Every structure is written in C-alpha cells, then in structure tokens.
C-alpha cells in the first residue's frame, strides 16, 4: 500500500482532492433564511 | 431624538429637531451652518420672540436666549427703540 506515510525517509505521495479537479455542483440548501439582531434584542423603543 | 439610527441616517430637519428637546447640533447638522445655530434653537419650546418686531422706527431685531436686541438707526436707540 501507498496511502500511509513513512517518516523514516519522507515517504509520502503527491495528493489532490478530486473535487478540485472535477466539481459536483449540487447547489446549496437555501431554505429558511438567517438573521442578525440588535445586541439588546430590541431595535428602538419609544418612550410612552 | 437619539438612537442607533436616528443619528446614523440622513440628516433632515423633518426628522430629529422637532418633536423632543432638540438640545443641540441637530439644527446645525441639517444645514451645516453655525450662524443661526443659537439664533433659532431658542425657538423650539416657548415660541418666537422677534415676530412682533418690538423695535419700532425701522429698527431690526436680534434674538438672544432670554433678552432681545433692538438695533435702531443713527440717533435712534432704546430697549425696543423706545
Ligand atoms: Ca425622528
Ligand atoms: Ca440635524
Ligand atoms: Ca439631527
């Protein structure tokens, strides 16, 4: 086998992820969106 | 008057200095002009003071935070050109 690397003499083969060479663009999961909010949780109250 | 966005959006006189205290600058921001900054902000709570033209005999008016200046011409003077 070749996959395991050996540190006796720097034995390790050149590797590359396959997705880089060929992509499989499924898309994404763009369902229920996300949001950011004020640090106190209330935007602006109005004295009443 | 003041908020995270009340003083972050566009400066408009039809927004900040009108319905609260209008302490300062928000009457100067809209115009970028320190000339009528304190000759108009005195007229936010109690109403105007020179609209009556207390100075007669063709005398101009000047508004101060409590008292009124009446400029009367050569040989004319007075607290209200009086
Ligand atoms: Ca406002
Ligand atoms: Ca302003
Ligand atoms: Ca303002």
């Amino acid at each position: 086998d070749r996959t395991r690397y050996f540190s006796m003499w720097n034995q390790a083969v050149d590797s590359y992820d396959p997705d880089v060479r060929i992509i499989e663009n499924h898309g994404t999961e763009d369902e229920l969106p996300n949001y950011c909010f004020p640090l106190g949780g209330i935007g602006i109250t109005d004295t009443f | 008057a003041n908020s995270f966005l009340e003083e972050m959006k566009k400066g408009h006189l039809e927004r900040e200095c009108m319905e609260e205290t209008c302490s300062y600058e928000e009457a100067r921001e809209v115009f970028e002009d320190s000339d009528k900054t304190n000759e108009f902000w005195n007229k936010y709570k109690d109403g105007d003071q020179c609209e009556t033209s207390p100075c007669q005999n063709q005398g101009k008016c000047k508004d101060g935070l409590g008292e009124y200046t009446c400029t009367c011409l050569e040989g004319f003077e007075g607290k209200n050109c009086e």
Side-chain angles (χ1 to χ4, degrees), chain B residues 10 23-24 28 33 37-38 44 46-47 52-53 59 62 68 73 81:
Chain B
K10 183 178 179 180
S23 302
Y24 296 138
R28 295 176 64 186
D33 191 79
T37 276
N38 295 325
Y44 180 82
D46 40 324
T52 55
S53 281
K62 154 181 162 184
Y68 29 67
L73 289 192
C81 299

Side-chain angles (χ1 to χ4, degrees), chain A residues 44-48, chain B residues 1:
Chain A
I44 25 174
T45 152
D46 254 333
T47 37
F48 296 131

Side-chain angles (χ1 to χ4, degrees), chain B residues 17-18 21-24 27-28 30-31:
Chain B
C17 258
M18 191 171 287
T21 41
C22 179
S23 302
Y24 296 138
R28 295 176 64 186
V30 186
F31 287 65

